[model samples]
Target chain A: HHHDITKFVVTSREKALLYGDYATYRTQLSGKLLNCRKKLNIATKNRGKFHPKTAITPEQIAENTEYVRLQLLTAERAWAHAMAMKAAHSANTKGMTGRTRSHIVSRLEKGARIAEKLAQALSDGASGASPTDILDARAYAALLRGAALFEKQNWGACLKSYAICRIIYTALATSSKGDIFKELLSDTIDPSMRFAAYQAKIPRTLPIATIAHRAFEQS
Target chain B: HHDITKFVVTSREKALLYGDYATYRTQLSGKLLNCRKKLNIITPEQIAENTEYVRLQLLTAERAWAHAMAMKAAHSANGMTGRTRSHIVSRLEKGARIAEKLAQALSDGASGASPTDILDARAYAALLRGAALFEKQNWGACLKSYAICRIIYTALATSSKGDIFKELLSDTIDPSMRFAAYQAKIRTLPIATIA
Candidate 1:
């Protein structure tokens, strides 16, 4: 793949390990940032003129999406390395899973699934519609748990991985602090990146005990 | 008197910013801790105030050092018997000493204590007590100690430095996760358990 080729071609190992020219790309990507923050307070309604579509460019949106994407990847890589499988000391290194690589592959797939869900959520909104707290949620823990379970074919785990995300979004929507990326997080992302969720019927709320079941708590 | 002028005119919020926490626990509260010792560098009006200021930094560094040690423990498969655990507990002991000093620093005349200062002392004490409880294998009590730290820090961790401290604390002090890593070392659980 181009990534492997880029590895040796890059001047710095740290740059390669981080997945790309982090400093350079991030600077370029951050050049375009969305500025508007949606207020939850009925008292603080939007009185100013706002155009969601024209406010942020697709290029600018791509940059930030990639920023969080890379951040997500970096965090997962740390976990993968920490959780990677090891074997008893021996010369039999062949045909065995490389500590982090195998785990990372599964994690990447899981991350892709969440990103797709997020895209769908955005697409459900009307074009040029003012943004909402649809994207304020943190999905790292969920993505990690989801993939680890998915790798093991744990169907129940996959359900909770996605479920916990719903709970997290609820918290982010209600936070007075707007949950970290208030102004930065938005639904109006790049065209190719946008996805609408499966048009499955809206489901009723799960029991509190079921929704809050942490990874360790499940059988 | 001129050096002491730096404090009298300084804003406590800013003074809170310059705590030995100035770094990731690399340096103790800044030069003020050193400067105050200089004869006649403080006013009678502000001397007590500066005491808590210096005490806050010591606690910050104490937490940072122990936090770093606990994180180091997180990466390994070892249980509490690991050298990293010892490093963590020793620093927690050191942190308790800082709390003792902080308690002393909470003088009656220490006016102008910032919310940041109060939160720092409260969180530092909670973490100190938490680590002591953790060393004793009081798992439930240890969990509660970190919970108390959460209340103080969630209020203060708004600042970036506070966020750094807060993030480290949450990442390390999770008892279930910490013990799970150790259990993985003792033996990897089956998919049923991981699920």
Candidate 2:
């Protein structure tokens, strides 16, 4: 879900750029990024602020950590794509006639590197931090990457990066154990809780495939 | 967002037909009709009952509904197309005849409706709802609508009257203040107090 929304945002951003509506693009990008970050903050706060001793087992935590990692990776990808798209648009609009291929490549390369660094910073783990905190870090990193990529005329790459970030963000919504971190300690954590625990987690993983397909198609 | 979501659910139900999947469709249809029913359940519970809320509100609800309604009046319009291709596939796979004029009319009706309504209801609403729910953003109605819209097909129009319930459900996510009743209140509201 987050992936799809991000896709829409990225698409809107692309359209805005294509139409040369820098102001609208900036507004939408910032608002949407803020919204994503807020969500991440909530998730992280829920996870880290209140320790879940009973319900989320060590195994579940491990699973969730991996999930978060995947999310960060996706965020990285989305940020990179968004940055690339912005850069591409900027270069295209500027009409850089004298610039050599190396210059163009260098521009793209620089954007990608910045995006990658941001991704790494977001994913750096401090155990017991809320999922939302982790998510905020990740989303912000993506935003940074996107901004850089936008400067480099790498629209396609930027879109891909944004898509990945969305996928990761969406995945968190469907997490079972993570959703109830606060509740597990108070009540008897149902290890075999069939419905909400597992069901919520499934869709989080499903959107990745959809986003992946779209990314390839767009590419 | 909730109102837009309901509008989309209604629109989608109006556009499609039902069969064995009718049970799921019926449940979803009922949900769409009762778009305002807020449950005591948590987000996880609501989603577990059905991920439709997640899918529709998050993935396709808003774009699908808006597109369907917009396309309804303008069947010949170019940009108002909904999931006609997807619909055709589902109908054919169920051994349903594509020869049905109603279905054909819907497929052709994409041109008249505003493209934004169609695209936003299906793509934006769905994606928004799913993401919101996943992130635990407190848009309960949007989440519920996602589950409901997935099941109910529009083809089950009132059996006795033989009229399609076009306005009963929607594909777009309407988040207007007037449509606020359509959404369920979360345990903790995100609304802020006046300073």
Candidate 3:
């Protein structure tokens, strides 16, 4: 239990790092931060324009969009690394540390699989009709990654990964249901709390969970 | 020139991923996706919700604020990483495969460095006021962690951090200004062209 407590504390700290503050935490609750007013309100004011699209020309729009896209991909990779670490931590705790090697391998394999699916989806032109579509694709990919990490008993990574998914999902919700983003932002709790909620729902212990239980239980 | 062409092609592919359709490529002038909706109608919708505040209970509010703050921090770190990689990509394109060392000492030294000051401000006292206030004194610590992050950036950037400081100096604008401006700007644009 001592180890478990430590894991919980560390997980909490990581959660704080990923979620930011109360507003962003709230936005994470309903999947995505669709409550745009709350989330982007200050950003918009500082930007001196309501929408960034208005500030740039058509050519610049294309350029900037491409820039953001690449950044998103890079961010995804970093997030995956973080998730892997979380899985390792969980494995250490549960006494199922032996499975760590295979678990990490599985995560990478799953990520590659999803990437292929995303590429295929784009090529087949089955993507969404808006930025929301791309966000959904990214969210789905992140969700799969998070689920894999969770199965590996990487509680911290699972939370962070899912939080990423929630953020992407919220972005999608923002585009699909305008104005609700702000409301969502002010309403939900932090991703850690949501993660706790999510973990409470899962039953049975895999190698990852068994190990995580050991660490957490030790604490 | 081949690499440049490839870059352009990749960029275009990314743009299409974000819903920038080929047909509307020339017509749309901004980052906002111009779908099949009437611009005027969309503008009006934007305008209608400008002043609204999606109020919630204190507990839920605090969590949401924390999430945004963390997301912002993650984004900043990711941005810095991207800039470094972009520099590398540029260097690599010059036909030099230079070995680069990771900045081992240059770690993300500070905690809670992801959120903006405003977000930190909103979340600072939340943990103190929540039900687990004492048991979660670390919650206060976390809030302070965020506060410290905010202060460090303010101290480092000083005046050059743009409107955040200006808003702090002037006290003229509120947080809701962005929503209002979005609504008003959408109103001014040619609504018929939205689609």
Candidate 4:
């Protein structure tokens, strides 16, 4: 389903540059991530940039934080897509959870890793504002790690990981400058809790209302 | 993850704003962590002490979200995988949702808020979403999003004032037009948009 068009259909050059740089990095990352699953055969075939001639620079990539954050976005998307497809596939066949041998787990792992690395690359944006940026990245990574483990049914690990991210999310919010990461915490607080309980099946349960209160004061 | 969704949604401002005036190479995300933190921490119902400060803060948040989304579109353009493309489209929708929310806030009781300006913000977001879909090769959804944008622009142009949208997004419109032109064989909108 290839459509004929210019390098990018986007209007703004900044969008173009960000997309262009990311596009190249994504090209590199995909094969590498897949290589972790597929091994050397397909790996060697797709080694370099999708377009080295007009590729984005390191500084360009670093300059834009979205490039880093978009990784988490896409990582979550990839994981979610993989989960939906697996769910659909399982439903089509009916009640085959134990030994499904589904090949889709690798795809979900890849997505999880992509999400992890994306957040991993970012340094603290607020060194002056305490451990906000560094802690934010750690919390963000924990969100992804929790998901990756959940896919494997590692309930204890998943719960622990979510707890880890939650701790960081809480600390960032309560710190002297914790208010800075406040919006970030409130937005993600509840969702992570959902993952901790339903996805990880932890023994102790947290009511959505209670965590919402602690993680974010809605009113 | 809502953690990054709002930023990527709004980061389009980085693409458009600094796109026009790169002089401020200063990343809008300089304070991204806390803005997101605040968006999460504060309660709309619990309310604001200073209406003006709250309003001003929302505008800045809106700008940050827009900047993030545009940069995402820029990155998605060159990506080769369906997974990556689809992820990019997902954020485009997220960005639009928040953009609409921000517009709702702006055009609320705050008297200075202009209805046209609200439409203007909404229109730019839709246009960007459409373009990002085009990158994912979803022609019909892209076209439909573009159509909504066009309709909004029409709303603005036909208002008491004139083509503010044209100034903001007219040039951006062409690429979406170019994307839709050859997709006559494309399927319906929702089917095309979500994929």
Candidate 5:
């Protein structure tokens, strides 16, 4: 008997994201997101960089879960854009053309920024978010940021970001019977860390947590 | 790396118990099947020409079967009902049948599979059957299937310089044989005797 709190973010639009092309999906998603932002009164007005804070206030969260859903869609749209370009050009023999890499990184940075604010918004106790939901948001932030750092060859930071993911995921994994966290840890996090550790000259002989701790401390 | 079981344990053990690497395997199995289908549609002769690719798919299919059975093992905490056990067992037996069919496909000369590839596929089929029979509690039948694996792997081990054969023997085949022998009430039977 455990709560899979992270279920909301995964495969929510399975048809659009998984089995179909990303470019079409990302474009279609933007119009829906525009409507959502307008409805929530958070739409950007093509104004200056100094927009008011977009974090969901505690009172807004109490009003409805719509803000949370908005954040999820917003983050997904950005992530989908990044993934679209990534898939489009990754078939090159040399892998990831230089200009495409920058565009992908830029999109991921925006997504990561959104996810981080979402985590902070949910972190407030009065926000009505569950502890696992908060942790999932934090982990999601780190995962996106980690991928961005990885592409930039910021190996130490990448390792640290993924270490955050590993710790949170491991905690979630222990209290649950499902295999989602474990699979993500084994299939995604471990490979990312191993390659990052190699780039950073960290030995592979150490336990993953140990490597993670060292990386965390070094920065 | 060092040991077959040990390496898999290191990489997969954390999630191997009470886990759904079964889902992961099933996902991979689907991907491989998709690859085969695409190859078939694109170039029907590709399957026969690309024996190595065919062997690779066979390996994945066998792995899917193994992972499903492993999940069945992990989930059976204690005193599981016959219905539950049989449900899992039947799924695995179906997987075993699929593996056997692929194994036969790989064994044929017309498929262009090499001698070693044929042997490997044959051993995998036997291993799947053995695991299924073991779960079924058919000790004699289990031993028969495993003995086939033991003999094939032993022969392959002697010829190869790779660790795959040695690791398979030490990690899976040998251990399975020992346990099966004990269950059959013949603890002293050597590999030679069984094979």
Candidate 6:
């Protein structure tokens, strides 16, 4: 509620992904997360080795926007690992094997799951997340879900997930004067949606928005 | 042959220009027009609302600074008259005041800005304040404000690999420091002298 977490996370992620490699991007994100955790007094001490916590406590959820930052960053790190793995092998003439593909899917699924937990927390009134913040988290979760499903080649499921994100982001774009939402719509979501639709054998005659809208309704 | 100082306001991904203040003023006006229309959602009543309001306020403050800079640039080639300088001074002071308020807002625990963010906002406020004092010919006050900006930017440049801080220092702060020091009849103190 205290910050524009969505704008900060999504836009910075886009910049790093575009200008730098995913591995480097994830490393940057990890440093940022550490700084944030330290500020919140949640950092593990240097006395011993630290194990990462996959689930956030209720106390953490209500603490500050830092929790939201942690979740988003953790999810992004996992997503980057998968993307970096895929990128490193892109030069190979042979397509990715079933084993490697499954590994990628597992990483994506981990990110998608983290985002889902964040969305759930934000949706609850007790968490003090604003309505706008809730929608942003929901849409982000949907985007991660769509990414994972797309990697899995679950065409129908992927299309629906992206469709939800598209619908939510469209509403946000119209409501605000900011260009971030519109850029997301054009640069990230639109291309992904178009490809997912094509894979699903959706008619090219229908506009992308119309196809997304239909999927959202059915969901 | 030299790279000119271009003032930039960033929002994570987007880097809005403040290089040519006249051009910047026009763009800011357009953004303000849309922003004012959406004030319903961006108001400062709630916690989430506070951040957007602060962002909106930051833009509003920058718009004033832009106009002041635009007017200052308009007379640079021909030199400024007393009257021209006074108009520029008032606009710059207004920008400084708004920037101060923005820094204050960020410092509030409820605003959710990080400590680094708060320092950057203060540096920006001091920059505007320094510029206004420079136009007023108040050399001492101008020097102090610019010093604050220099110290902060230098520290920031040391910590981050990003060129934004270095660009800001070289393009904006350094030149202003030279002029202000000259006006104040101060020696260019080097690192060895301080030690």
> What lDDT does each candidate get?
0.42, 0.38, 0.36, 0.50, 0.69, 0.74
Candidate 1 regions exceeding 4 Å error are A1-219, B1-88, B100-104, B107-111, B156-195
Predicted structure with the largest lDDT when compared to the true one: 6
Decreasing lDDT order of the candidates: 6, 5, 4, 1, 2, 3
Q: Report the CA-based lDDT of candidate 2 relative to the real structure.
A: 0.38
Per-residue lDDT over A1-219 for candidate 3, one digit per residue giving the tens place of the 0 to 100 score: 011111222243345448463233323422221233234232423566645432212333233333223322332343355454554476455654546546554745555354435533432343322444445445545555665656565776676666775776566556556233323323332444356545665434443423432343344
Q: What is the per-residue lDDT of model 6 for residues B39-139, given as tens digits with 9 covering 90 to 100?
A: 67422244245444665666777777778777877777885789988988898898889778777766774566666776787788888898899989987
> How do the residues A1-219 of candidate 6 rate in per-residue lDDT, one tens digit apiece?
444656876766777878698888878877877887787776445553465655665456787667777888888888888888889779762677878888889989999999888888777757876788788888888988988999898988998899998898899888995498888889878998888888888864754323432343353
Q: Write the per-residue lDDT of candidate 3 for residues B6-114, one digit (tens) a residue.
A: 2223444465565443322332332223221233251222323421111111112222322323333445544345454344334222211110010111113222122
Q: Score the docking of each candidate (DockQ).
A: 0.02, 0.02, 0.01, 0.01, 0.01, 0.01
Expressed as tens digits, the lDDT of each residue in B84-181 for candidate 5 is: 67766675687677667766766554665567766776776677788788878777677777777777777777777545767777888778867876
Clashes counted in candidate 3 amount to 61
lDDT of 1 by residue, A2-100 (tens): 111111112232443476443343333232222111111111244654543223233433334433333333333433332333222133546445654
> Candidate 2 residues A1-219, lDDT tens each?
122222333455456568665455555554554555455443423556475422222233233444333333334344444444455557564554434434544544553454354334334533344555546345444544544443444555454444454445445434533233223212211221222234335245555324432343343
Instruction: Estimate the Cα RMSD of every predicted model relative to the unseen true structure.
Output: 25.2, 23.4, 31.6, 25.1, 22.2, 24.4
Please write out the lDDT profile of model 4 over residues A107-189, one tens digit for every residue.
Answer: 56776566455444444332222234545556766766766666566767777777887787677567645443465456555
User: Where does model 6 exceed 4 Å of error?
Assistant: A43-52, A57-59, A91-95, A204-219, B1-195
Interface RMSD, every prediction, one decimal place = 8.1, 9.2, 13.3, 16.9, 19.7, 24.9
TM-score of each: 0.28, 0.24, 0.21, 0.31, 0.46, 0.46
Predicted candidate 2 versus true structure: per-residue lDDT over B114-184, tens digit per residue: 33333333332333333333223234433443333222323233322322233333423223211332344
Docking class of 2: incorrect
In model 3, which runs have C-alpha deviations exceeding 4 angstroms? A1-112, A119-129, A155-160, A175-219, B1-195
TM-score of 5: 0.46
Residue by residue across B15-111, what tens digits does model 4's lDDT show? 4553631222234444444445555532233223333333334445444444445555556557356666566566556655655565455455453
Model 2 RMSD in Å is 23.4
Q: What is the two-chain DockQ of model 5? A: 0.01
- Candidate 5's C-alpha runs over 4 A off are A1-5, A41-53, A92-95, A204-219, B1-195
Number of colliding residue pairs in each model? 5, 98, 61, 33, 0, 0
